[PDB]
Design an enzyme around this catalytic site. Structure first.
Site, PDB file in Angstrom:
ATOM      1  CE1 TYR A  53      46.677  43.319  50.749  1.00 56.66           C
ATOM      2  CE2 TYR A  53      44.412  43.887  51.587  1.00 56.66           C
ATOM      3  CZ  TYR A  53      45.748  44.294  51.098  1.00 56.66           C
ATOM      4  OH  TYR A  53      46.018  45.606  51.212  1.00 56.66           O
ATOM      5  N   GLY A  60      49.043  46.265  50.644  1.00 56.62           N
ATOM      6  CA  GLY A  60      49.472  46.838  49.508  1.00 56.62           C
ATOM      7  C   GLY A  60      50.836  46.043  48.945  1.00 56.62           C
TER       8      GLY A  60
HETATM    9  O1  HC4 Z   1      46.575  46.333  46.722  1.00 58.41           O
HETATM   10  C1  HC4 Z   1      46.018  46.200  47.504  1.00 58.41           C
HETATM   11  O2  HC4 Z   1      44.997  45.420  47.576  1.00 58.41           O
HETATM   12  C2  HC4 Z   1      46.392  47.288  48.780  1.00 58.41           C
HETATM   13  C3  HC4 Z   1      46.389  48.599  48.479  1.00 58.41           C
HETATM   14  C4  HC4 Z   1      46.554  49.528  49.373  1.00 58.41           C
HETATM   15  C5  HC4 Z   1      47.313  50.740  49.394  1.00 58.41           C
HETATM   16  C6  HC4 Z   1      47.590  51.799  50.250  1.00 58.41           C
HETATM   17  C7  HC4 Z   1      47.226  51.337  51.624  1.00 58.41           C
HETATM   18  O3  HC4 Z   1      47.460  52.236  52.778  1.00 58.41           O
HETATM   19  C8  HC4 Z   1      46.621  50.151  51.986  1.00 58.41           C
HETATM   20  C9  HC4 Z   1      46.365  49.230  50.901  1.00 58.41           C
END
Ligand code: HC4
Ligand code: HC4
Ligand code: HC4
Lengths: 513, 514, 514
Positions: A53, A60
């Site tokens: 990731y 996200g």
């Molecule tokens: O699920 C994740 O790990 C990431 C979440 C996420 C949600 C909104 C954002 O702007 C960036 C990352």
């Protein structure tokens, strides 16, 4: 200037010392070595094109879009970009730096992959007299405030000097002698991750609460010296019968505060043998009202709540709340989970907030009793000086304290308001940053209520014991004399608003010693 | 051979609940009996010496400046119980009322209350009987009123409750339970009307219920992963070590254990996969789960740490002497006057636990919302219906009901912040701990109903996904579904679920999935 | 000769409560019967013409995209009632459940719901009987679930309640009430499971209760003035005219009326007095009363204006058609699809009223707190006790109970702010109006108990101040105290007051001091 050597663990006091600029910060050799090892691991993960990731995916719900190595610079640059949607007043200087420190402590554990340069940028900021200018709102619990932090460190965002005066990005780098943050190593996620903001806000809350708690104790004691309070209710024997650590500590500190006092009542009422002739109505009851008699129990419960909050926060501060993370043992290339979910700080901040509101209420009722001519055992109404009627003394300040408390009560826990967001990916959120911020506001209100009580007690002590404070304990005398160095007695009505504000600022940073 | 709890000085929460629930009988250990007899003697001396002591030679509250002649102490204490019996509202449930009695007893057992052997025996008898005093739940600012009502009950001047909640008049209660009418001739009434017994009793029942609900929260989160191809790497022990919160480490460990042996969860660590040019594109699913699964250890963990703190504090409170006045066993002074009855500890912990419960109930509610959403449940029928779609809606109503229950929980906040100066300003600060404990209990009940809905949904989902044989489901998951199916049939066609939800919720509060 | 309410188009709140409480029968006016017959025919035409209509040719919620063939509609609607019957929690009380039935009926009476004659007759028959459907209070996000349970009840597949709340099974209810089992063969089930009937029924009962409690709040404030030598100039009409809030003007006028004829209140306007040189100094008392008396018009007035707003909105809601879909009486289109079922109006007004009730309950609690304080009650006994002081504490316990009840009220806030996306995100915003109305009701009940305590205190205080003959007390004041004394004896010595407080509270919610 003292130095805090960061290896693996740092306590709350050390953290506040660095965040507040009272101490420089240095990364111990072992930590530098672990971080260098993690830096190498990130390099290998990248060379091996492991599915990670932020290194080979979108963010996200967009993580299902895999990214080619050649586009990772753009990927991480846009991460910082889209996240910089924060709004609201900026975090104060100490708190913003506490956030920077929180991210650094996580990185120092050696599982974030941060490059030596990135780490140096955080250390440099903390050793400077500056703080990044980061908006307080925008996170559901701390990518947004950390993204703003990154922009600042790159010279694309404002900085704050100790006074809160803002400097533009370029001026900040120049004045603080800071080099622009370079994320060429693809270690952006080491900076935009975790619970750094809520943890930074919370550690500042912890420090402030320790000082206010000391004031709460010292003023309860002085209250006793102004109203002929009974010390038997603060007896150690009672603590032993109901052994809550916070209560025992409170009772002990209360007894110490009034040691040497000739203004308190020390007789144990049960020692008195009654005769038929004594039967009837006596001038006063044998026990005090709860604002004095139950001080150990109320203060103690608040202290036990703060102890829990601090235990949990100490773990959080020294933990790695990053995602993804790179195992130092090399068991797997990287781990993907949810250590960024700030539920711990959310729940402890909410609990502490309730405790603060409860203790503020105690202080407010102490003012309400001390200023009531029907309840203050002979003291002037509202502790006025000069002709009565023509002067009202602290009558306005007393109402102001009630106003401050009522406002505190209007705001409740932040944690119960989780709302599914991010296209339902973040279907549960902690709101820990909001929780910590709401707790901070209550702490500020509590400081103001205590400031009013302090000013009332300095006046009451003099009205009861004369300017010489005859019969007042050494501790009580020292406290009043200290206050009087900056706050004159109230011989005739005058505006107190500015004095209350000035004193509150002091109570939050120093204890009565 | 009903288990027996021998009370001396310390009793843990499980023992306490065993006695309150009637699962164990209670006995006073010889050392405790002696300490109490010694305290009984001290009270007698204090009275003979006409010492200035609250409740023995003085009025109550602000009326304490009114001294009372020894000849009128009987009347003094009788009117104390009388004026305090102003409680209103529904009576505390059987277990909780008994938990209050136990809490008062434990305080007395420390030997500083002056309670007479008969008084102590009356409490023990009640606890060993199948009865509970019928006491109104409202009226205290934190617990004289509910305790005064208890006194009247033990004197046969108040109703009793059987295990089912059916009321018996005072006389019938003493008769059926073989209880002797409470006799306060020794002037030890303050040993019964004192302390934080009610809030403590309510809180100890809350502690027990939360342990079970927490187990269901873990078991259901695990079963959810088995129904949605959840990724187990998010629950890895290595992650717990990096952020060492005890509650989180425990939650993760328990989750891993629940899915052990499952062929339905995804166990691959995504970072082991090496990507090449041909892999660059858009994949069907992201490499990580939504938070209701991925962040379960962190959410559940924070809740567990809150419960742990609550229980640590509650254990101290339960075993403490919250009486006033008190008679020091060492004999240093005839008596001490203070405020150990101020229930701020239970007030603050109950409020904190209430918030944690609301947060965990929110997690369960979002789990239901995800599982029942055809756009998010990876191939399962909308609302897990069976039969033709449209003609059948499955758990569509139950899903909304879960949301409604959660929304209601959120409307109520901490009780502690509402202190109001009362008792002619003598009680200028009050804890409201009893209210706090009761509000927490209500949320615990809503949480159980939400978990019940989630459980019924998961039983259905497991079969829809894996067939009636539950092929690929973990041993633990299989056992849980099979157990549920023993009393709750599959939803083959839409039917009223309300009664089943309520029935299952009652079960979840008392037993864990094992 | 049991009164009869003839329903045509509009019914006011008083008539609605009269029917819901069983104090009046209900009859459908000729024009209403005809409008309904015409609508019934329109529903028949819609089905005959196979018009695309929610619930007649479609699934429910997000499942509406599944079209249904005419031969499966009986099953479609049967399962609708089935899946929706997921309610839990204590049942709505007799009056409130009937109020819900009435609310649905009034909507149908507008002639846009398609309900058949039999369906309408079943609602009317229920309202004219002594029964009510037994319906769980929780489960709706705002009212399909409670209404579905209603349908089952009316079919003899759910319990019924008698005036005392005792439950009867489906068969017994239809028998005892001489009711015909509900038949939905005309496919008019959506005429029964729709709209905001539950929250509206709850709210209309709240409106009735608040009117009476408001009258007691005024009556007791006035009696308090007679017990403490209150100054009437603060209640002068001139002040109302200077700050023309309707509720305030009314509150001041009602207060003046209550103390008309009183010789115990101070009527002298202080500004009339001219001060000399020997007057300068400290007088025994201030020229103005504490706010619980001096600001009564302003505090009560703000609450009265809130109730007025609540009632204006509720009146529109009760007489509106909150159904979906609807069949336009003008025949413009076969049917309209929208969201008139969204109960945001009742949610917001219930939340606003709940706040007002809490504020007024606070006033009463402080009035009790002042009256019972020997330092503030101008010469009255501490806590209004009789018999020797100390030995007796009078209302000391009741006073604390009042504070505890108020603190509990404060712990619960507005329900409306907790909207959570549900129903697979289809219901992404919900009103929670039913919950809001229910939370308001609980506060109203607490307010009644607080007023009950104040009433008992004032009866005692009046006799302590003016003797048993109530010398100098206004005619209204005398009538109130005498009325209370017919059922509640003086407190000559301390006694349990809990049962009396509860009994009086029940009375205050249904009758005003007249
Ligand atoms: O699920 C994740 O790990 C990431 C979440 C996420 C949600 C909104 C954002 O702007 C960036 C990352
Ligand atoms: O201050 C105390 O120790 C007594 C408080 C009290 C308040 C109300 C009562 O009804 C009895 C005791
Ligand atoms: O969108 C609509 O009109 C239908 C909503 C709905 C939601 C849950 C149910 O159980 C039935 C209908």
């Amino acid at each position: 200037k003292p130095a805090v050597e960061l290896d693996r663990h740092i306590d709350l006091d050390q953290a506040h010392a660095v965040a507040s600029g009272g101490a420089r910060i240095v990364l111990a050799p072992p930590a530098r070595d672990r971080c260098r090892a993690s830096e190498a691991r990130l390099g290998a993960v990248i060379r091996e094109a492991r599915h990670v990731y932020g290194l080979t995916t979108g963010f996200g719900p967009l993580a299902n879009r895999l990214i080619s190595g050649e586009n990772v610079r753009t990927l991480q640059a846009n991460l910082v970009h889209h996240l910089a949607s924060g709004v609201g007043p900026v975090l104060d200087w100490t708190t913003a730096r506490a956030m920077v420190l929180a991210r650094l402590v996580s990185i120092a554990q050696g599982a974030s992959g941060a490059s030596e340069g990135t780490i140096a940028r955080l250390i440099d900021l903390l050793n400077s007299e500056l703080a990044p200018a980061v908006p307080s709102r925008g996170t559901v619990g701390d990518l947004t405030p950390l993204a703003h932090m990154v922009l600042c460190l790159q010279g694309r965002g404002d900085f704050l000097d100790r006074d809160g005066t803002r400097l533009d990005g370029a001026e900040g780098l120049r004045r603080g002698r800071l080099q622009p943050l370079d994320l060429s190593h693809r270690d952006a996620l080491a900076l935009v991750n975790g619970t750094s903001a809520m943890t930074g806000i919370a550690l500042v809350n912890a420090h402030a609460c320790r000082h206010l708690g000391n004031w709460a104790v010292a003023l309860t004691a002085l209250l006793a010296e102004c109203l002929r309070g009974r010390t038997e209710a603060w007896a150690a024997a009672l603590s032993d019968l109901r052994p809550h650590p916070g209560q025992k500590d409170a009772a002990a500190r209360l007894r110490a505060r009034v040691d040497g006092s000739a203004r308190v009542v020390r007789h144990v009422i049960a020692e008195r043998r009654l005769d038929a002739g004594d039967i009837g109505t006596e001038p006063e009851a044998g026990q005090d009202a709860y604002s004095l008699r139950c001080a150990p129990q109320v203060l103690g419960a608040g202290f036990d709540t703060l102890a829990w909050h601090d235990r949990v926060l100490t773990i959080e501060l020294n933990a790695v709340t990053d995602n993804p993370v790179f195992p130092p043992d090399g068991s797997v290339p990287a781990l993907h989970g949810g250590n960024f979910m700030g539920q711990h700080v959310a729940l402890t901040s909410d609990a502490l907030a309730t405790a603060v509101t409860v203790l503020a209420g105690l202080a407010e009722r102490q003012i309400a009793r001390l200023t009531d001519e029907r309840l203050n055992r002979g003291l002037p109404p509202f502790l006025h000086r000069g002709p009565a009627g023509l002067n009202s003394g602290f009558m306005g300040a007393q109402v102001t304290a009630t106003a401050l408390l009522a406002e505190m009560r209007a705001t409740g826990p932040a944690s119960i308001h989780s709302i599914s967001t991010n296209a339902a990916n973040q279907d549960v959120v902690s709101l820990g940053t909001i929780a910590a911020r709401l707790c901070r506001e209550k702490i500020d209100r509590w400081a103001e209520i205590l400031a009013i009580l302090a000013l009332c007690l300095a006046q009451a002590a003099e009205l009861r014991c004369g300017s010489g404070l005859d019969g007042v304990s050494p501790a009580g005398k020292k406290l009043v004399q200290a206050l009087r160095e900056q706050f004159p007695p109230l011989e005739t009505d005058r505006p107190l608003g500015q004095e209350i504000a000035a004193l509150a600022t002091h109570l939050l940073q120093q204890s009565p010693v």
